[PDB]
Hints:
The structure is cut from a larger assembly and holds chains A, B, C and D.
Chain A: E1 33-35, E2 48-50, H1 54-61, H2 63-66
Antiparallel strand pairs in A: 1-2
Chain B: E1 2-4, E2 18-20, H1 23-26, H2 30-33, E3 37-38, H3 43-57, H4 63-73
Antiparallel strand pairs in B: 1-2, 1-3
Chain D: H1 6-15, E1 20-21, H2 23-30, E2 41-47, E3 61-63, E4 75-77, H3 85-90, H4 98-104, E5 113-115, H5 121-124, H6 150-158, E6 161-163, E7 170-177, H7 182-198, E8 212-215, E9 221-224
Helix pairs in contact in D: 2-7
Chain D binds three RNA strands through residues 1-9, 11-12, 35-38, 40-43, 45, 71, 127-137, 161-168, 170, 172-179, 206, 215-217, 219, 230-232.
Amino acid sequence: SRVCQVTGKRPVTGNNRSHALNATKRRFLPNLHSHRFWVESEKRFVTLRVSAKGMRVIDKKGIDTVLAELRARGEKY
Amino acid sequence: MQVILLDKVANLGSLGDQVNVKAGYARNFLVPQGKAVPATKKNIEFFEARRAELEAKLAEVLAAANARAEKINALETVTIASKAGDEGKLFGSIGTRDIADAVTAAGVEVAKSEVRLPNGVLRTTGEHEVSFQVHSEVFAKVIVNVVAE
Amino acid sequence: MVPVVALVGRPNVGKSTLFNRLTRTRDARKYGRAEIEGREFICIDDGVETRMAEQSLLAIEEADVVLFMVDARAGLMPADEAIAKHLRSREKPTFLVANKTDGLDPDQAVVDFYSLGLGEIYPIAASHGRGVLSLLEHVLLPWMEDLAPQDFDPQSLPIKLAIVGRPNVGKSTLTNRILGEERVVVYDMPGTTRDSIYIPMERDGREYVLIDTAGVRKRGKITDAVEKFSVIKTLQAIEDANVVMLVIDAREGISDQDLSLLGFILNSGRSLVIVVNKWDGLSQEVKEQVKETLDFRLGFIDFARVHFISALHGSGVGNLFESVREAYDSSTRRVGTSMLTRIMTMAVEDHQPPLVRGRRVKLKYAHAGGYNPPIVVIHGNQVKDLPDSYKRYLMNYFRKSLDVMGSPIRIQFKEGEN
Amino acid sequence: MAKLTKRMRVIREKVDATKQYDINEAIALLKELATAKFVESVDVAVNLGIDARKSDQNVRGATVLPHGTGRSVRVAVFTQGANAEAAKAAGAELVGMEDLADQIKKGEMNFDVVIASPDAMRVVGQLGQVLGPRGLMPNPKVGTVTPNVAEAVKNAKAGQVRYRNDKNGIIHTTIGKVDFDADKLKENLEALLVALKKAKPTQAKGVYIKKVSISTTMGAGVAVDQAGLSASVN
RNA sequence: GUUUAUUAAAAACACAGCACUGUGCAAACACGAAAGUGGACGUAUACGGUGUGACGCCUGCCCGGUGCCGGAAGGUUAAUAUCGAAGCCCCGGUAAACGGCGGCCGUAACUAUAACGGUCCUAAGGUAGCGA
RNA sequence: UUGAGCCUUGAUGUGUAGGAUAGGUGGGAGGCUUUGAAGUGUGGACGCCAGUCUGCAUGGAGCCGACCUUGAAAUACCACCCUUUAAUGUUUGAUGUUCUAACGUUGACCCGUAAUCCGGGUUGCGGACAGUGUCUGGUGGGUAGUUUGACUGGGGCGGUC
RNA sequence: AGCUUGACUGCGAGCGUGACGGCGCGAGCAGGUGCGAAAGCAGGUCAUAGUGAUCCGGUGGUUCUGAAUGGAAGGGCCAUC
């Protein structure tokens, strides 16, 4: 997809906008990328699709804490 | 993020230097390689007590890694220790090509720019003879006896 | 050689307002003089623009007498004091006046002002009427002791020309070149119109204009709060022409506004000569033949003549001077009922005057209603009996059979016979 | 030209970096510090913003203040059609248009502070061409280009603080001498400090007071335990 | 040849041939938010696009070298009010330049048209097609 | 390799007057600046260099200006921040080059699986790029909504308000 | 031609003239002024044309407003763009 698997993402509703203030809508994709994280706790990579807010978030809490979850979020490790 | 190093010495940062670093260097080089451990005001306390042991007891056959490193960054005088660099000069058949294993920088190497030899090289003691190519399909050679202690 | 009042009083404000009220002469345009009795003299007009400091500095040294100005609500101001000091050292006499004087009868003058390294500050009028009288009298007296400098042929006027174009290109710079070849700045403003506007100036008698609103390298005394006022000027640029020059770029030219601008030019009814400036830096395969082709097809029958100059090199410089003259001759061509009638006959015989409601029309002479932008009025059948198109067809024919590298020519139709 | 900016680096490294000092302590310090040979000046260096308006910023003048004491000056009260006739009733000082007129136009002057209505003021305190003082001179502005005369004489008789440089948006005001007492000095600051808050109504930034600093000369200066701020007038 | 089924068959549309451009493969491009797919199991003598319309016959003018043309800013030539602008380099622009594609003069036999040079310009120079 | 954000040194300010070179001094003609203090490059109004030229390389005069004039100002002792300019501390961004470790790999092979898909692993090649996400400037009749009066001896035309 | 600054100020019986928006005339009182010897005259121009609502914002003044509560912003008001 296009979702962090942590932070919680998906494109979300938009519009182009003008000082004209016209009406149209467009959504908005977050900045996610599947980045090859190193589990270390089984010393392998479990490449996950993740946000780039999230990339930070994973770091601050540490590998097996995001990876503590997933299991607790009932979804592909 | 920030780490306390585990590394003995490292070209910047050394010997339990707790510092902040680039995120893109830190998570994919300083860790996971053993050259650092994450820092937290929890971690630092654990680590401070630990490093009187860890950055000593581990870090004492590792003097080799900093020295041997030059020799594999150039690949002109391809030299690693198989057991050595901490035992005196690099000796025995042991080292590079006698198992055809030597560490590369990034798989782009000048240590297999030709293959030709019938049982590899290395077979002296108290020094270790490497083959130092002079072409890429003739092996007229210029063998050296470098060490990297 | 000759005096100039030379207003100063800080870079801007009501400074201009006063010049208009002292002048009355337009189309002499700028430089330009304020008339009093018999004698007329010129007028001349932190962290401010470097260009604006250079012109202003250029103005005051040639200036021959100076007038330093203060406002009602203005008083104290050290910057003013610096400008006043500069003037003393360099040495020309200065009188201290104060704009739309107001207050509540003369009071705070002269009291602040004695420190100004100047004494007696005369208060003025401009929106009342007594306070102008003293200033004009003061100047008069020394100036009275002295007495300083104060079909019709194509050569009866000197050729009038403007330089119009985009609100992007540094046209004002190209303007500096055209006036130059001397390697000298020239956009020093004096004031002589009604209100705060704008330079047409003349060199070689013949008039050049600088126009539009910003990017032009309009960074002036200011007067067009919105996008509008500038346009009031370009319409002046129309009034004054018999030649207009369009600067277009090869890298921001022919913009939507710009193509409209050429369409407008056709209305403007004045000779088009097409300039491309800052064209020595363009890529070796030019973009730009096609850019010429799209304008060509719209299409402007004139003489072009394309110019590829820079204001930062100059290449086209002669070829521009030349092209305008040639264009003016054709435009201004001595005309004459005879020629027109004779070529016309051919045209109608060849391709057929239109018929309307089973009744065939009738043409029967043409004459020239003036030549400078050439107009003709042909007396034939009714206005609607021709479409505008056939008018134009017959016009285009004349545009063809006798050269018009000049402006579009005009055709009219009157009725009387039917 | 510039050999090394070393002598100034060590010195500024001692007592400036916004080292906030007791106002009085500062003054105690102020007389000497680096070898400046005699007792020096007490200054406040007040930083005000902007250009296009002043209220008491770049003033080639002196204004009346709470606690006027420090100096007392010569004063003549010029009483001509104004708040002069209120001044005639007041009878403090000397009030007289045509006798003080003479005295103005005589050839000689010494009544520095012209409290004034229209004619006198232009003469005394402003004149010269490339004006500027022997080190001090009769000054023009005294707020009688904001004429009042009667009440003005009371304020005037008492004295007055002169400050001047040129054109910068930061308003310097020399507070006094060190041959004036420490606590009287503090009061001079406080007075100017209350005034400044008062000053400037014309929005361009709603707090116009940056640094209240107190300083002398020879790379010696300090900051005040800032107390000019917006809250009312303190 | 193709075609407006249920008015209109053509001169329309098509078409080989030709011309031009764009594209080096993960191709251009095209579809498909993308994934993917087509393009192509191919591979610049092609591929895509665009455009013109068999065929034959009507001559399609390269800016680099060096020169030339206009122009200024300079260079170069000047006085030595130094600065040096006019003519020329250069900057742009220039091949109806050297050199392949006109006249006019002499000359391929009614002189005259002329392959060569002179002459207009540091134009090849009516050779092709076509002649009162 | 190399721009610049800031930091503190530099010293001074063309009309008679004014020695010239008068930005801006609380206070204003002691400070025993003790040392026997100086006239010699930056500076400086302005090159109008001069000389006066610099806390700016000499020792030669009590510790010392070796006190003012005079104009607007200018000489005891100095003070208040600017324009300007370095030297130095820096702070930061560019380019330059090389690297590998993200990342890409429509290279090659091994493997789940006697599967052109995919996944994992190995290796080869690329490489901090590329590309993409946000933000953001320019372009954009391709797409989108609509705008284009009225008077009127038919209307439009014109002319007019 | 002398002299002045009433192109004052705060109000206004009472009128004309407009559908309304509204526009015009108007003595006198009051207060302050100005000029005139004094009476007296001065409320912009011989009269008739010389321009536009409403918004919304700018300028200056005011305490009027002002959300716990004081200030403070913005808004109203008065004047003007």
